[PDB]
């Protein structure tokens, strides 16, 4: 994985109608200065975000490892399948965005 | 659409200070953006100066060169970046750009990644 | 405190020639590939032509390709068509985001 970036997983998550989604995006800081962002990605290929680590139905949890952090959407509905994706945005030493691959949910 | 628009530009004298504006518009200071300035004298190449980080932590990144000299900031009431030049000398005769890096969805986003440019304003440091 | 050295000053090339620009930072940028190459034209902004880290959707043609890692980095153009006489810049960036600067340079010229 180059430029160490973090990641988002599953790649396909599949989850009936009114129960919870779970994305869980992974991002070891380096820096201790950074933001995350959990973007839904529409086939118009424009992308909108959803909640932040830095905090509605779309929840931003931080896990235990600090490295790991869960992304929850409560109550899915059917028109919430898509693809999503968590970006990494730290402000010092070094100012990146750091993006994973994009997953889907049905 | 987004745009950028410097302003303030004009004679300045040598010694003197001047604050250049970016007006902003048509996107938000969201969390995934930085705005910066470069500059470019008549027939010579492209200068960085600094950027600042759009959003709550304010984060200023300077050239070595204009640290000390510059100062970068935003207007907390609206969607604007200052540059504040001061000591100006004649070598600061220039053209200046503001340009906007960052985003979300293009993988990779670091300060060389400038996709968004002003038309530039002119400073001429001249008694 | 780096510096990146752009090769060569200016080049005098036809349309359809296969062109390239090379830049060298004294110091390897950020994460080996933190350099971006942009296109300006008299009178005009520059514009974003390459980010080296990442590959583009901002409808750069498809001719121009960036090439290279560490501290030696190419420009690529395969079919220089009429548009793309102008000067080209590249941008490095390196740990401390202090030490960005740009290259000096490449103007490419039309050969008659």
């Known amino acids: 994985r180059p430029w160490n970036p973090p990641t988002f997983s599953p790649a396909l998550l599949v989850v009936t109608e009114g129960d919870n989604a779970t994305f869980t995006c992974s991002f070891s800081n380096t820096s201790e200065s950074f933001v995350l962002n959990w973007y839904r990605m529409s086939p118009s290929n424009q992308t909108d975000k959803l909640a932040a680590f830095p905090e509605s139905r779309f929840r931003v949890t931080q896990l235990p490892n600090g490295r790991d952090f869960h992304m929850s959407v409560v109550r899915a509905r059917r028109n919430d399948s898509g693809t999503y994706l968590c970006g990494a945005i730290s402000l010092a030493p070094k100012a990146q965005i750091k993006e994973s691959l994009r997953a889907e949910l049905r | 659409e987004q745009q950028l628009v410097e302003s303030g530009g004009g004679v300045v004298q040598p010694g003197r200070s001047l604050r250049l504006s970016c007006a902003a518009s048509?996107?938000?200071?969201?969390?995934?953006?930085?705005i910066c300035w470069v500059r470019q004298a008549p027939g010579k190449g492209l200068e960085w100066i600094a950027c600042?980080?759009?959003?709550?932590?304010?984060?200023?990144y300077y050239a070595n060169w204009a640290k000390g000299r510059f100062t970068i900031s935003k207007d907390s009431s609206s969607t604007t970046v200052f540059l504040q030049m001061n000591s100006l000398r004649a070598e600061d005769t220039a053209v200046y750009f503001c340009?906007?890096?960052?985003?979300?969805?293009?993988?990779?986003?670091?300060?060389?990644?400038?996709?968004?440019w002003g038309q530039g304003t002119l400073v001429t440091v001249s008694s | 405190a780096a510096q990146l050295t752009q090769s060569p000053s200016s080049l005098s090339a036809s349309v359809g020639d296969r062109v390239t620009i090379t830049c060298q930072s004294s110091?390897?940028?950020?994460?080996?590939?933190?350099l971006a190459w942009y296109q300006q034209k008299p009178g005009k902004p520059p514009k974003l032509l390459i980010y080296?880290?990442?590959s583009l959707t901002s409808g750069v043609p498809s001719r121009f390709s960036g090439s290279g890692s560490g501290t030696d980095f190419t420009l690529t153009i395969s079919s220089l068509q009429p548009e793309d006489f102008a000067t080209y810049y590249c941008?490095?960036?390196?740990?401390?985001?202090?030490?960005?600067?740009f290259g000096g340079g490449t103007k490419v010229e039309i050969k008659r």
């Open positions: 048509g996107f938000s200071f969201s969390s995934t953006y930085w």
């Open positions: 340009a906007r890096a960052g985003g979300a969805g293009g993988g990779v986003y670091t300060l060389t990644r400038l996709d968004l």
């Open positions: 941008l490095g960036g390196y740990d401390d985001d202090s030490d960005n600067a």
């Open positions: 600042i980080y759009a959003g709550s932590s304010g984060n200023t």
């Open positions: 080296t880290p990442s």
């Open positions: 110091q390897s940028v950020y994460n080996n590939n933190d």
